C-alpha cells in the first residue's frame, strides 16, 4: 500500500501530459527491486519538463535501505520514456556534467542520471545546497526521429 502512495505522489509531481504512473511489482521500503518503479512517456511533438531531482529525492526518501536512485531516459522511436529506478541497471551512468547540460537521443537511444551524480554536479556548481533552492529539471523536446534533453537546474521565484 505504501508504494502506491509513493508512485501517486510522484505522479502528482509529473505533468499530466506525460502519460504514466506505476511502471511495468509490489515492494516494501525495506526491499528494492531492479525493475523500474514508475514509468512516464511523451508522444511526438511534445515539449515537456521532468522534475527529475525532486522525484529521485522522493524515492531516496521513501527507501529505508541505502540506495542510489536512477532516472533512465530513452528515445524509443515513437516517444520519450522516463523510467524510475532505485538502483541503476547493469550495463548509462550519465553523460551530463556542469559543462554539458544537453543530451540528444537518436532512435532506441538511452541516457540517464543518478541522484549521487546529480548531487555531485550540483556541488561542482556554486548553487544553493539548501532544500528547494535548486531543483534540476529535464527540458524535453520530442522531435522524431530525435529527442532533445536539457538538464537544467531551476530555482525558486519566491515572488
Amino acid at each position: 500500500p505504501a508504494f502506491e502512495g509513493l508512485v501517486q505522489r510522484i505522479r502528482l509531481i509529473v505533468p499530466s501530459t506525460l502519460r504514466g504512473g506505476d511502471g511495468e511489482g509490489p515492494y516494501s521500503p525495506s526491499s528494492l527491486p531492479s525493475r523500474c518503479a514508475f514509468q512516464f512517456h511523451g508522444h511526438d511533438g511534445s515539449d515537456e519538463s521532468f522534475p527529475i531531482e525532486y522525484v529521485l529525492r522522493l524515492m531516496n526518501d521513501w527507501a529505508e535501505v541505502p540506495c542510489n536512485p536512477y532516472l533512465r531516459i530513452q528515445n524509443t522511436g515513437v516517444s520519450v520514456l522516463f523510467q524510475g529506478f532505485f538502483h541503476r541497471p547493469h550495463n548509462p551512468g550519465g553523460a551530463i556534467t556542469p559543462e554539458r547540460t544537453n543530451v540528444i537521443l537518436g532512435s532506441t537511444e538511452t541516457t540517464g542520471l543518478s541522484l549521487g551524480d546529480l548531487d555531485t554536479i550540483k556541488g561542482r556548481l556554486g548553487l544553493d545546497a539548501r532544500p528547494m533552492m535548486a531543483s534540476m529539471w529535464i527540458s524535453c523536446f520530442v522531435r522524431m526521429p530525435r529527442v532533445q534533453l536539457a538538464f537544467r537546474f531551476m530555482g525558486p521565484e519566491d515572488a
Partner: protein, 242 residues
C-alpha cells in the same frame, strides 16, 4: 545517504499537504545557469529547440532563449516551409532581395572561369541553401555574406555563412527553423581568420536558371559587394571544413 537527512524533514512535512507540494514544485520557473560554454567547431544538432548561440570575443556559449536579452529584444518575418518555398520560387521577382546570394555566384563563376548559368542551375538544385539564406536574412536589414564551395563527399555545394564583425548571435527560433527546414543538412559553427562562420553541408518546386541568369545579367550589382566576395573567397579557399 545522498543528502537524505536534509530533505527527510521537508518531505515529511509535505506528505501531509500535497497541494502545497504541487505549488512548490510549480514555483521553480527560473533557471540558475543561463548560459553554457561550447567549443568550436560546434555542431548545431547538439542544441535543443530553445537554445541560442553566441560567438564573440567573450567566448562561445549557448543560451536559454527565454532568458536571453538578445533573444527577447530580437524576437525573430515568416519562416514557414511554404513561405521559404515561396521565397525560393519568387526569387526571380525579388532578385534584389537576394543580391548577397546571387552576386556570390557571379564572383565565384568569374574566379574559376566557368559558365554562371550551369553553377546557378546546380545550386538551384539545392534549395536548402537559399532557405538558410532567407531565414538568416530576417527582414533584410541584417545580411550575412554567402560563399559556396564544392563538396567532395556528395557533389554539389556546401554553404559558408559569413557573419559581419567580431560578434555573432543566433536566435533560438532561427536555429530551430534552420535545422527543421533542412533535415538533409548538418550545420557546424566555426571561426576562420578573425571571421565567425556557419558551415552547411549535406549529411546523407522547380525554377528556371535561365530566366534568373538573364536578369542577373541585365542587373548591375553594387560593386564592392563583389569585391567583398572576391576578398572572402580569397580568404576561405584554404579554410578546411569541419
Amino acid at each position: 545517504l545522498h543528502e537524505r537527512q536534509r530533505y527527510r524533514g521537508l518531505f515529511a512535512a509535505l506528505a501531509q499537504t500535497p497541494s502545497e507540494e504541487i505549488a512548490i514544485v510549480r514555483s521553480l520557473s527560473v533557471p540558475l545557469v543561463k548560459t553554457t560554454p561550447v567549443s568550436l567547431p560546434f555542431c548545431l544538432d547538439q542544441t535543443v529547440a530553445d537554445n541560442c548561440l553566441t560567438l564573440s570575443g567573450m567566448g562561445y556559449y549557448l543560451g536559454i532563449g527565454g532568458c536571453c536579452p538578445a533573444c527577447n529584444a530580437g524576437d525573430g518575418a515568416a519562416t514557414s516551409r511554404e513561405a521559404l518555398i515561396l521565397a525560393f520560387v519568387q526569387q526571380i521577382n525579388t532578385i534584389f532581395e537576394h543580391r548577397a546570394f546571387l552576386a556570390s555566384l557571379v564572383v565565384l563563376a568569374d574566379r574559376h572561369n566557368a559558365p554562371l548559368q550551369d553553377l546557378l542551375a546546380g545550386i538551384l538544385g539545392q534549395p536548402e541553401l537559399f532557405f538558410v539564406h532567407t531565414i538568416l536574412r530576417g527582414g533584410g536589414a541584417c545580411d550575412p555574406r554567402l560563399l559556396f564551395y564544392p563538396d567532395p563527399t556528395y557533389g554539389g555545394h556546401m554553404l559558408y555563412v559569413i557573419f559581419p564583425g567580431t560578434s555573432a548571435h543566433l536566435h533560438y527560433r532561427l536555429i530551430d527553423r534552420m535545422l527543421t527546414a533542412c533535415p538533409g543538412y548538418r550545420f557546424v559553427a566555426h571561426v576562420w581568420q578573425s571571421t565567425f562562420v556557419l558551415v552547411v553541408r549535406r549529411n546523407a518546386p522547380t525554377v528556371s536558371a535561365a530566366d534568373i541568369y538573364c536578369k542577373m545579367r541585365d542587373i548591375s550589382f553594387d560593386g564592392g559587394l563583389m569585391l567583398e566576395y572576391q576578398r572572402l573567397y580569397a580568404t576561405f579557399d584554404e579554410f578546411p571544413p569541419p
